[PDB]
Amino acid sequence: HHHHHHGSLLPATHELHIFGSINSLEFDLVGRGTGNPKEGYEELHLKSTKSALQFSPWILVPQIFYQYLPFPDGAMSPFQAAMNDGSGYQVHRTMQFEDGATLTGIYRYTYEGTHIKGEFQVIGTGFPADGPVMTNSLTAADWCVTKIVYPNENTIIDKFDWTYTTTSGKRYQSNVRSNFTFAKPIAANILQKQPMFVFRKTELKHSKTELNFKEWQTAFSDVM
Amino acid sequence: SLLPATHELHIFGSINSLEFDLVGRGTGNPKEGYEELHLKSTKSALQFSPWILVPQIFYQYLPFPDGAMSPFQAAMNDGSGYQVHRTMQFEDGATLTGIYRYTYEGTHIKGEFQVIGTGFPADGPVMTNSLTAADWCVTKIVYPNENTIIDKFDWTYTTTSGKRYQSNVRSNFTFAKPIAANILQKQPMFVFRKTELKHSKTELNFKEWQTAFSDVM
Amino acid sequence: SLLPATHELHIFGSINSLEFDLVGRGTGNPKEGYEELHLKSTKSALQFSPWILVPQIFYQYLPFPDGAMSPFQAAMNDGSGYQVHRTMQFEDGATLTGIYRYTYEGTHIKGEFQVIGTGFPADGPVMTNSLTAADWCVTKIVYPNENTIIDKFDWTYTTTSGKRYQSNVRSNFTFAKPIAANILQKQPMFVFRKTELKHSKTELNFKEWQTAFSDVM
Amino acid sequence: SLLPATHELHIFGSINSLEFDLVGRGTGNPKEGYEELHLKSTKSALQFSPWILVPQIFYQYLPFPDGAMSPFQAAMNDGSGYQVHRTMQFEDGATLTGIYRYTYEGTHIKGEFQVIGTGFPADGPVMTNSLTAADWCVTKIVYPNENTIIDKFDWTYTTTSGKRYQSNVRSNFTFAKPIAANILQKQPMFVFRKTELKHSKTELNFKEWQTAFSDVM
């Protein structure tokens, strides 16, 4: 899109400001990343602007860019099409954990050419003081299949069952739904591609002040 | 014991990305669980049912039984306060989150409430302004630890079509100071609430009656 | 107006594939909302908390306010009856389904309840016999149509560890004949219930009190 | 070494209290995740969409990647077996519970599946036979302990109106003997399934293809 950029306008770089609180404990992180929007790969570095995180940095995954996700056959995903034409979308995600904790993420983006700027507000509450989030006991996130559905032409809901492994070997579960609101209607040729799934893998290296994150995503309508 | 007499609210956010922003003042009786609030839009008319802001639009006015302070009142009394994070999941897949923060000046409360609602169908009763009232409701309160309250309720509106419009609601309250042992010992606690809302396109006049109970037998 | 005075129950099924089967009789007071029931296992010791069978173990004892019949009593009264399909979804992922069917012999009720539960952790409070009591509870009754009711409640037990053990419960009632209009219009309706269970591994002695209410103010 | 070649099903229960009973026979290919089944009503015409019996109507035909026995196959191979308790919660409030029990005789499976469904609106697509197909589906499998599998999937039908009809499904499997440790170390496991159904009101002809996968990349 754009008189001096004739191809699709897909992301090459991003930056994130993520902030909010977990059990009223305030956090704020900023950082920059890159990725490959033809392969569904992204990576991001973050650093606290407020000293050490008093909870598992893994509770920020998957809060920490579907603009890097292509659809099959080199097609644009609806996320990519909304960045391509400047119209955009918003996200409102809610995670509901097996221990009654809730985590809401509110994601907003602006775009400058192939660079994305994210402002994500995240609020989590009701994490038990001896549970794995507050004791920093999460070790990894399981690989995950999300299903994409379209309640109308301007909305997507994605849905997934999200599980971490913990230092004890036990899993820690939540139900996640993400409501996407698009400023412009999603193209009919995307809407007809149902059902659609996305396989995702994440990695995270962290200290108490810094995060180094990676995600691979692959959309698929079949395996067989 | 310093209980509230007056309040003000700045409530803002969006419903299906449509932004709103309202400000106003109210009063209430913390010995009887009554409050009333007027709000006015700082933009234009709301582009959705004003009823979707109920019960977003002050447990500081709720006494506990036999004249005791509720934990919400105790937290105001000593200034330590609490936060609210509320999530409503509707039958049609919509989600509404409310994030409530307060400051206190003597017997005056100032509320800053952020509300984000998404996934309301364009032909549903929220977006077509077809909600007519909110059913009276019983909330259940438990205390999972000395700093945390979880309340839960099934929230239903009546609509012009006669079909009720339902959501399941959970509210997580986070307290800066521990809640009194003697409060913690009485679980669960229930609260019976009635609401009223009169509105124009730009102004809302809201009332709420709330009464806590352990038993009705 | 032929209200219940006695009942009997055969309740059977399995918990995590462990079969159980109990039988026994009871009495109650359908003007007071009281019932008691004594059950004995027909398959020796229960291999799980007997409290997981509460509230599986008779809304025909529930009057509505001012001496009115509840819809459940009315359906006994005229013989037409109703069926129940209840699902409880627990915080630890376990699911318990109950299927309740009744026949009537004058003022006597005969129940056949099938109950299947799975997914209870081996180290959770049901399988370790660590439930200590069931919290008092308010249920909400709604009517999707003239021959169905849905009831909903947040069910919690206390346990020996101090941590409550929670589930969301929904009960779908299917009535053979339409529920009277004068009942349908009393919405919303709530019921306050209290239960007691004294037990061994083979014998359960249960009591329940229930009181319908439209308001508390 | 022993995998199924044939199966028979007796599936029975009720939808909105309307009783149904079907019986029939099928085959499949357990090296490839394929099965087909024919069913005929033993009572009258089905009083609701036959598609609501999909996926009630055999993971013993599912291999795991690389010519592995699934744990479902291993349990048939050694005769120890497993039971299934499935709950579907639909977007309109309906609930459908399935309870599946099997016996084996050589390479033949005999299933006895009890299905109870309630809460389907009179005007909804199940009761108006408005379901047209089931979307292709990915299920997630996890193993909470060595005797239990939980599977989970979002199940959607297409309908004559064009609006999909959605439910959240969970299935709890209880195994009589422990699942092998090598199987337990690989989770989550996913399964891609495709179904077909041709039907009248009295007869169903069903096909399913299933492929387990740990990755797609």
Give the residue among B83, B79, B77 at the shortest CA–CA distance from B98.
Answer: B83
Neighbours of chain B (3+ CB pairs under 8 A): A, C, D
Give the residue among B158, B137, B152, B136 at the shortest CA–CA distance from B51.
Answer: B158
Structural determination approach: X-ray
Burial of B192 (0-12, 13-18, 19+ CB in 10 A): buried
Q: Rounded to an integer, what distance in angstroms lies between the CA atom of residue C175 and that of residue C144?
A: 12
- CA of A158: which chain D residue's CA is closest? D154
Kindly state whether D138 is in contact with chain A, defined as any CB-CB distance less than 8 angstroms: yes
Residues A195, D156: C-beta atoms closer than 8 Å: yes
**H helix or E strand, kind and range, residue D156:** strand D148-159
Longest C-alpha distance within chain A, in Å? Answer: 56
Q: Which domains, from first to last, does chain D contain?
A: 1-217 (2.40.155.10)
Burial of B70 (0-12, 13-18, 19+ CB in 10 A): buried
Kindly state whether D122 is in contact with chain A, defined as any CB-CB distance less than 8 angstroms: no
DSSP 8-class letter at C99: E
| Residue D48 · residue D127 · CB < 8 Å | yes
Residue showing tokens 């439930």: C131
Kindly state whether D217 is in contact with chain A, defined as any CB-CB distance less than 8 angstroms: yes
| Residue D169 · residue D153 · CB < 8 Å | yes
Using an 8 Å CB-CB cutoff, list chain B residues near C187.
135, 164
Residues A163, D142: C-beta atoms closer than 8 Å: yes
Kindly state whether D80 is in contact with chain C, defined as any CB-CB distance less than 8 angstroms: no
Residues A24, B93: C-beta atoms closer than 8 Å: no
- For residue D30, the one-letter residue type is P
**CA torsion, ordered B55, B58, B63, B64, to nearest 10 deg:** 60
Q: Rounded to an integer, what distance in angstroms lies between the CA atom of residue B70 and that of residue B180?
A: 10
DSSP chain A: --TT--S----SEEEEEEEEEETTEEEEEEEEEEEETTTTEEEEEEEESSS--SS-GGGGTTT--GGGPBPGGGPBPHHHHHHHTS--EEEEEEEEETTS-EEEEEEEEEEETTEEEEEEEEEEE---TTSTTTTT-EEEE--EEEEEEEEETTEEEEEEEEEEEETTS-EEEEEEEEEEEESSPPPHHHHTS-SEEEEEEEEEEE-SSEEEEEEEEEEES---
DSSP 8-class letter at B32: T
Q: Rounded to an integer, what distance in angstroms lies between the CA atom of residue C202 and that of residue C50?
A: 9
- Kind of pairing between the strands at A13-22 and A115-125: parallel
CA geometry: angle at A14 spanning A8 and A15, to 5°? 155
| Residue A129 · residue A27 · CB < 8 Å | no
CA geometry: angle at C203 spanning C198 and C205, to 5°? 40
- For residue C42, the one-letter residue type is T
Q: Which structure tokens are listed for B46?
A: 């709301």
Burial of C28 (0-12, 13-18, 19+ CB in 10 A): buried
Give the residue among B128, B64, B139, B72 at the shortest CA–CA distance from B100.
Answer: B72
Neighbours of chain D (3+ CB pairs under 8 A): A, B, C
Give the residue among D94, D193, D102, D106 at the shortest CA–CA distance from D141.
Answer: D193
Sign of torsion over alpha carbons B91, B96, B97, B99: negative
Q: How many residue pairs bridge chain C and chain D with CB atoms within 8 Å of each other?
A: 65
| Residue B109 · residue B102 · CB < 8 Å | yes
Q: Rounded to an integer, what distance in angstroms lies between the CA atom of residue C165 and that of residue C48?
A: 15
Q: Which chain A residues in 9-68 lie under 8 Å from chain B, judged by CB atoms?
A: 23-24
Resolution to 1 decimal place, in Å: 1.7
Burial of D88 (0-12, 13-18, 19+ CB in 10 A): buried
Kindly state whether B144 is in contact with chain C, defined as any CB-CB distance less than 8 angstroms: yes
| Residue C81 · residue C174 · CB < 8 Å | no
After which residues does chain D show a gap where C to N exceeds 2.5 Å? 57
- CA of A221: which chain D residue's CA is closest? D136
Q: Rounded to an integer, what distance in angstroms lies between the CA atom of residue A142 and that of residue D142?
A: 11
